[PDB]
Amino acid sequence: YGPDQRAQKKGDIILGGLFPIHFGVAAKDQDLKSRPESVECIRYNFRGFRWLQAMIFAIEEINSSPALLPNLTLGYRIFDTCNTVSKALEATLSFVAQNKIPSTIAVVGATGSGVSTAVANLLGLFYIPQVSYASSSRLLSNKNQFKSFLRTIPNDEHQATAMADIIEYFRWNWVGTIAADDDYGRPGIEKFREEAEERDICIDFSELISQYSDEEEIQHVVEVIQNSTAKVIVVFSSGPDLEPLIKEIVRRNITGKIWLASEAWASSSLIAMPQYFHVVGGTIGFALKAGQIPGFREFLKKVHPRKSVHNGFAKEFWEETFNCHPLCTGDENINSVETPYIDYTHLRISYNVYLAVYSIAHALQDIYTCLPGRGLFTNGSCADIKKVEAWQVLKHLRHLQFTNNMGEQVTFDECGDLVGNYSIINWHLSPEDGSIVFKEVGYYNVYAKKGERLFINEEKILWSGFSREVPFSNCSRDCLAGTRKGIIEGEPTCCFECVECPDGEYSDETDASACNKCPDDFWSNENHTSC
Amino acid sequence: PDQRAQKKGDIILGGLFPIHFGVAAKDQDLKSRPESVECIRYNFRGFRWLQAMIFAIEEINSSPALLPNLTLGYRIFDTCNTVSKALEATLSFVAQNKIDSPSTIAVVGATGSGVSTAVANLLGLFYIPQVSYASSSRLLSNKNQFKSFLRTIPNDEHQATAMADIIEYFRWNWVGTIAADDDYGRPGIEKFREEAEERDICIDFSELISQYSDEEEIQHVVEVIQNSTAKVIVVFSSGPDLEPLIKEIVRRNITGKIWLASEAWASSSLIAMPQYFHVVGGTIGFALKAGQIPGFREFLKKVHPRKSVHNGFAKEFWEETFNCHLRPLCTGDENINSVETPYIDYTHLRISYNVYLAVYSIAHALQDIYTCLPGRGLFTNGSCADIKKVEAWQVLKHLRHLQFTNNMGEQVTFDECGDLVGNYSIINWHLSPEDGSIVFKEVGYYNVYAKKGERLFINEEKILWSGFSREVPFSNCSRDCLAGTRKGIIEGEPTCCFECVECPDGEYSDETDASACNKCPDDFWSNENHTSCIAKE
Ligand SMILES: N[C@@H](Cc1c[nH]c2ccccc12)C(=O)O
Ligand SMILES: N[C@@H](Cc1c[nH]c2ccccc12)C(=O)O
Ligand SMILES: *[C@@H]1O[C@H](CO)[C@@H](O)[C@H](O)[C@H]1NC(C)=O
Ligand SMILES: *[C@@H]1O[C@H](CO)[C@@H](O)[C@H](O)[C@H]1NC(C)=O
Ligand SMILES: *[C@@H]1O[C@H](CO)[C@@H](O)[C@H](O)[C@H]1NC(C)=O
Ligand SMILES: *[C@@H]1O[C@H](CO)[C@@H](O)[C@H](O)[C@H]1NC(C)=O
Ligand SMILES: *[C@@H]1O[C@H](CO)[C@@H](O)[C@H](O)[C@H]1NC(C)=O
Ligand SMILES: [Ca+2]
Ligand SMILES: [Ca+2]
Ligand SMILES: [Ca+2]
Ligand SMILES: [Ca+2]
Ligand SMILES: [Ca+2]
Ligand SMILES: [Ca+2]
Ligand SMILES: [Ca+2]
Ligand SMILES: [Ca+2]
């Protein structure tokens, strides 16, 4: 059978699903004293449950549309990954059960690049297409490695360049970098490192973090941050991988810092806590272009613990949202409790889930509506939808082109990626609410020419959550007239000494490389300003 | 899989080896149902490592000292240096366990860190211990991720520091970096990057490569190398991942470069080719601690396709050695000594020794299973493991707490991260005068047990730079500032890149590579060359 907690529904064609319904697994690192029992998943993820719902909603919406996959039913087998490779693989082994009892023709998921890579290695083997709604690592664009992998989220390459463009914009040359020690944080900071050095930005420190980092490991990173004159900190990490570090920085009230948030934690409920505002206030981050899902918000509200014969996560959702089953009536209202399930402004990753399901639906439709000699298969033959195999769906998904329910053109490139713009958000505090509000202060247009991609409105930004002045984050303060830039041995190029000009020489303008000799008739003034 | 090395036993040890260097590099049309991909370049060294697992298993079996009561059986598969082929095989090892959604109690392998990580994710799930003889990535030290992973090869962390120590030694400040775009090359160069920056070494370029890189992808890297003033190139890659790049550099006869070889390619048959010597000559690389396995070289010669019934790779080995079929045909009367392949053409057993050591680690862990009596145990209430009903997780707790004495009388133990420390030998790529083949001369050593700064030993006299010159090459961004001049900033370029600005009148510079010029005392004035001061002004 496979895992106990699941969202299952029978159909003619089955779509697998992988969602982080829980943030992690139990802190039980067994001594292996006895036979190891299955680990239990711990922190409930309401946002993750909302994404699971977007898959079901889309599946039901397709099932109701008679012209899309006519006289056919889309079924599903959705599992909880708990943001862990092991739990995800347990589930993936169930999807591939038949391949070496209904077949899984395609899989939606996973979230974390580390989890999606592990799933892709196993699915790729059986040519089952995988459509991830959130895994953005550049490593997943390698089609020699990931033969059946596609995604409805852009690759992080431009996001890391956008970081370096923002730094170049506000004219900062002294930054620090923090990355989650996974297939997401590591390639993201590496691309950023490359782009910052192109734009002559010096990186003072480059540290690694994880959700399972020691008190010792966290201490070292906090010390590195404190012992650094760099105020700009670039962070390529997820919420769970960053939470241990942020908790400690909040505890020590380290307030100077101006955080540059990667898309994974820029909208994380684990970091966007009002208690952390003294530390995380005025964070500049990335958000994906938001999409529209009409009727979805209504569908979310219809969730009932008893009703969901199909959704086995509906009981646990009810229990966590109402500190329930104390006991539940079942007649409880979901508008009353404030959880990220309904407490959202824009559907971004949820939209990517919706878009992922529709990509598979449209790929299956192209097989179905195929005309004798216009097929993608041998001699121009068409596949039989009644006898459809996963590899056939993959062939179609590879260079799929379809029109969005918003009327927009959706296409996957040669690396199975979607290209998308980014919205730039700033972490403000709502005066009335008291909660962290994500104000859209700019955008990053990836279609624009290099140097014309970034748009920022400085006026909408609240530095450190309060300040209205762009902070200083250069290694050394600029050399004034009468002085020249001097090298500091062991320190990088944008760390300089301001050496006073020698007698007979002058420094007319600010940040001079050397002083100019006065013409033979004249001599330097009292402080070498000019002669 | 069809092609395997199987033998029944009481306890089965899984095996993963790169019998082939890669798979048919082709985009599946997907016009037709995808068939099993074809593995392509035969790996004789890989086959010799597979043999070290069988030899060790047979040596344990014959010997009464170890498990006289039990027979060690095996199920060995070819990975073809690919995640997919390795996972196909791993799915077979876990076949019995998988039913919850013939037991394999432990697995030997794989080689590539990318392959071992994929295998580890699947094995770790079922707590089947995995002992890799060659996967050296630091990423595999993470015990939250890799619960059942252990290795008989050290972690690359000190190897990358050793690179930076060698560069610091020869006083070079301008280098380039090349890494295989995998879980091996990437963390190795990243650690090197940290260490080089701590020793004030500037990296001009940082490029990525792969065995499946485009003609365009390779061309970009060769252009980057050519357009760079850096002569020292640090390469963290395997032979297969580096071969496409080296082939092109040889084709363009780019000879200036001085290569710093990662342990994976420092002894690679694919790179250590005599037609590449103009390019790869005088390469400074790393080799692990060697080992001798008595009777192994005679065991290697005993291979026949009809006789070796258990080894299904013998047929293909035979065919690729004598260039025959089982285009001319093979005779069961062919002699092994006649054909010269890397199977017998080896000098030291290093990775082969790690395979031998990996099998013995599992053997000694199982041996500690019988010797157990209630009280001497680690389980339940001091409980022990029933060697007749042994489960893989039981072998794993024993392997974690494993301490045993080696074939060379050395203590073998695993870290809390399943690692084992080891020193490195530093080799140099020389040419045999008579033979014309690439000889690996041991020019130094790296002692990991020594204090920081005292770990490296090198004999410059034994090194032949570029394969010929005895002069340590220049590889700094800018030539040193002589007396009379001071160091000046270059706005775009890093700190290693400086201008040598002439001292002003009334000032001088006593020393080479000065930050600023010193003012002469009032009685004196600047020298003709600004190197000192002369009296009367
Ligand atoms: N992009 C991240 C994961 C991620 C992106 N956005 C998110 C929002 C919430 C949770 C996780 C994410 C990765 O591929 O690893
Ligand atoms: N250490 C490399 C593989 C490797 C080391 N030595 C080798 C010799 C031959 C072939 C491969 C190797 C890795 O972890 O990926
Ligand atoms: C439509 O579906 C029903 C139920 O699955 C089936 O009985 C009928 O034969 C199908 N029609 C076609 C055209 O296949
Ligand atoms: C910081 O450095 C950049 C580049 O050197 C420069 O343009 C900027 O003006 C400096 N910052 C200040 C404080 O002026
Ligand atoms: C944190 O520091 C800031 C500035 O020093 C200050 O405004 C704030 O009140 C401090 N927080 C606490 C815990 O008082
Ligand atoms: C990206 O933004 C630009 C301008 O803001 C727009 O022209 C483009 O349509 C947007 N992205 C997409 C999905 O095309
Ligand atoms: C090169 O490298 C360092 C500077 O970082 C220095 O010790 C050495 O003397 C330099 N000079 C030359 C010409 O090698
Ligand atoms: Ca329908
Ligand atoms: Ca997930
Ligand atoms: Ca620069
Ligand atoms: Ca979150
Ligand atoms: Ca330095
Ligand atoms: Ca025996
Ligand atoms: Ca291998
Ligand atoms: Ca090799």
Residue numbers in the entry:
A (entry chain A): 20 to 119, 135 to 359, 393 to 598
B (entry chain B): 22 to 122, 136 to 360, 392 to 602
Q: What are the paper's exact sentences on this?
A:
CaSR is a class C G-protein-coupled receptor (GPCR). Ligand binding to CaSR takes place within a large extracellular Venus Flytrap (VFT) module that consists of two domains (LB1 and LB2).
Surprisingly, the ligand-binding cleft of each protomer is solely occupied by an L-Trp molecule. Ca2+ is bound at four novel sites in the CaSR ECD structure, including one at the homodimer interface. Each CaSR ECD molecule also contains two PO43- ions. Third, the CR domains of the two subunits interact to form a large homodimer interface that is unique to the active state. Finally, the structural reorganization of CR domains reduces the distance between the C-termini of the two subunits from 83 Å to 23 Å. Site 4 is part of the homodimer interface formed upon agonist binding, bridging the LB2 domain of one subunit and CR domain of the second subunit. Our structural data indicate that the Ca2+ ion at site 4 stabilizes the active conformation of the receptor by facilitating homodimer interactions between the membrane-proximal LB2 and CR domains.
